[model samples]
Target: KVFGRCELAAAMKRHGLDNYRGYSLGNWVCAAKFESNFNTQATNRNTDGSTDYGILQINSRWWCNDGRTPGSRNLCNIPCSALLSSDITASVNCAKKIVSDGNGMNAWVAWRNRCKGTDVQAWIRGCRL
Candidate 1:
């Protein structure tokens, strides 16, 4: 049920990406790479006790307590794997909103900026079907 290279490429196409160069998927992949090396089940607990979970590194508390139910679960949680089963377009849209309202390009740019000088961005740029 998890996305591999082909599935990710399909999802990118379904999201209207012409190529992986500058699309939201590129940025999304970059974010995931930077955060957890693209591990959807990844979780991190900082020294301060803050915890981040899932591919997007969304904080569990933010997803559970803040009422963003979609953020609450994926494969890591019970019932359904929201990260895997949910529409990627919608997920990208939500990520865009969280990062830059409706400016999808801006969100990508922000992610690129945040992940500058990293191999993750390079990998996204280099991905091909």
Candidate 2:
């Protein structure tokens, strides 16, 4: 399901994305906008044979195991299918782990290209807490 901006912002806040790992909620919201357009069912197969899953596009190469990526570590210890669920908890949890790395939010190209150093506030400006 695709989420409206406010709905997505609320969910991210509910899951504690606000100021997580030194990144603002606005950054996270903007990343989600570019990554998958707040889409729970989004998936993209990279040419490297890694598949990205869920809204944040968690990668099969390092996070979830799709059994297709050659060197999948399944660092999140979750099946790739978990990320595709509308429940979203698994996706949030995995993304937290991704940020736990030294790369922080840079693990996501969308965040780096579209969210970093931008007016991320625009992504969550109208959301009421």
Candidate 3:
């Protein structure tokens, strides 16, 4: 399911993403906006055959087990399908693992290109969290 801007902002806050690893809730929401538009079923397949999954676009190449990617590490030890669920619980958990173990917020190039040096406050502004 897709989410409204403020609703998404509220959800991100409930997930403890505010200032997660030094990245603000707006930063995470910005990435989710550009990455998947808050759609839980989002998926993007790259030319290298790896697919990005869910609201955060967790990758099948390294994070999730899709059984389609070669040399799949499945580092998060979670199913790629879990990310596609509307609940977003697994997505949030795996996302935390990504920032803690993998790259920082820079892992998502969408954040770097769009949210990173820009004013991301609008992403979560006026939201009641």
Candidate 4:
């Protein structure tokens, strides 16, 4: 964990979870599982040991190291990169975008909706999740 409940809460709030409730926390957990198996310190590498990185399995060359500049938080950040360098707000913003686009509930709702459907991407598209 980040440190304590307070620390985690602070991080969540910092990441725009100030208004988060029960279901929203579920979505975040789901997203974390889907992305990195909830390993905040996870990293991946090829046999050559040519690449290594931190949580989110961030590829240094593609995201933090080279040409790509960080985009606006409203846009999807390249997953598995430096949390700071990447647009940390993108995930929350995505939920907002979906909600704003006439979808409902917010991130928590979106995840539930996503889980209930057979095709996640399709369902998200349908509900604008």
Candidate 5:
């Protein structure tokens, strides 16, 4: 539970996500804001029995295993619970792989539904990037 948008942005930048995969920092920040409000412990279950994990809301169907879910591809080779930690390295690494896998930021439904094409600058406003 980090405080302040600037702090989060700084941490993301320190992790080399400020402009990852040719996507703008604004894009990443905006996606994180909508996906989990920058909360590391965030989790959401889908109607299909799949779940979204952590700040980026990586899904169990492809990225990680939630233990209770069957048929998880575990493409990231990480447990879904690992993403709920305050340390975001694993989550960010998996997200980078996800973007490289061809979906771009579209890998996250939150990004597609909310952050995409919106005024993304506000996500990073006052962050002093």
Candidate 6:
């Protein structure tokens, strides 16, 4: 588990996600908060029979191979297990690639439903970036 918001912000910054893909650091933090609460081991089964993986909740449909699921595009070319690591380099890299490929932050449903158009500054407030 993360110690606090600042730690998460610092990690994201260290991963070079500050203002990544024209999105603010606050947006990424806000999305992570709602998607997985900064928990790297987080996972969720989707109604479509796909699962979401890790902090950004990347889908099994296209991003990662969970093995149980068939027809996963595995566009990220990484195991879903990699996303559950304390080291989030693979997850962050895949997420960056997803956003860079034209989805933007719209790739994450949590971002659109919760972080988008919200006052996200509080996500990074008091955090040393």
lDDT of each: 0.46, 0.89, 0.89, 0.37, 0.85, 0.87
Clashes of each: 0, 0, 0, 2, 0, 0
Worst window of 10 by summed lDDT in candidate 6: 1-10
Which lDDT value does model 5 have at 94? 91
Please write out the lDDT profile of model 1 over residues 1-129, one tens digit for every residue: 345544554565566553333444455565655665555555565444545545555544333232334434332232213433334543443443345434443433335566645454344444564
* Root-mean-square deviation of Cα positions for candidate 4 versus the true structure, in angstroms: 10.5
Across 60-99, the per-residue lDDT of candidate 4 in tens digits comes to 3333342332331213343434432323343344344433
Residue clash pairs of candidate 1? none
- On TM-score, the candidate that comes out on top is 2
By lDDT, rank the candidates, best first. Answer: 2, 3, 6, 5, 1, 4
Sort by TM-score, best first: what order? 2, 3, 6, 5, 1, 4
lDDT of 6 by residue, 1-129 (tens): 542678888888899999897788899889999999999999999988889999889989999999977767899998898999887788889989888988799889999999999998889999878
- Model 3 residue runs over 4 Å out of place are none
What is candidate 3's lDDT per residue for 26-96, written digit by digit as tens?
99899999999999999999888999999999999889999899887898898899999978788988889
State residue 68's C-alpha deviation in candidate 6, in Å.
1.3
Task: Please provide TM-scores, in order, for all candidate models, with all chains considered together.
Answer: 0.48, 0.97, 0.96, 0.32, 0.93, 0.95
For model 4, the stretches where C-alpha displacement exceeds 4 angstroms are 1-10, 18-23, 38-87, 105-110, 113-129
Q: List the residue pairs that clash in candidate 4.
A: 56-80, 58-80
Over all chains combined, what TM-score does candidate 2 have? 0.97
Cα deviation at 110, candidate 3, in Å, is: 0.4
The whole-model C-alpha lDDT of candidate 6 against the native structure comes to 0.87
